Design a protein around this ligand. Sequence first.
Ligand SMILES: CC(=O)N[C@H]1[C@H](O[C@@H]2[C@@H](O)[C@H](O)O[C@H](CO)[C@@H]2O)O[C@H](CO)[C@H](O)[C@@H]1O
Ligand SMILES: [Ca+2]
Ligand code: NA
Length: 139
Amino acid sequence: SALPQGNMKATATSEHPDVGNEGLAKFAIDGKENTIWHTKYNPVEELPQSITLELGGSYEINKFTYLPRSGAKNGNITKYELHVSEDGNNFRKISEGNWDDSGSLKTLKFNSTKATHVKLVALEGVGGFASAAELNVFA
Ligand SMILES: CC(=O)N[C@H]1[C@H](O[C@@H]2[C@@H](O)[C@H](O)O[C@H](CO)[C@@H]2O)O[C@H](CO)[C@H](O)[C@@H]1O
Ligand SMILES: [Ca+2]
Ligand code: NA
């Protein structure tokens, strides 16, 4: 079951200002599929870039989901790392891999681990950007 996004805070290395349905980091956890976090594209900041979710406490987590934007593909993430921290400072890599560029939900499962923060690192994305409609973390 998903940890409540409402208790979370989102920050990112790069984010596009609020021009509607993009591109602030907080849009990745607002519960709306029509709103997205998107990395700066004026002018563009190159990958890699990341987004960090402060969980709102220490939880033991085993799953992560990435929902891409709908109706367009720019920034759909195709190569990632997932890192965790228990102190907000030190991060450790727990997952890495590839995703297809489609709009489909991407799911990561991993051995249960304690975390106060989860960081999604975007190494590759459509168009040289990174974006996300919704991010969720599961215990
Ligand atoms: C609606 C949309 O997809 N906006 C993204 C935007 O995508 C393209 C532009 O790249 C192009 O110049 O014009 C298109 C018109 O159909 C469309 O707006 O590109 C942005 C990054 O440059 C960002 O990804 C927008 O989310
Ligand atoms: Ca959203
Ligand atoms: Na934090």
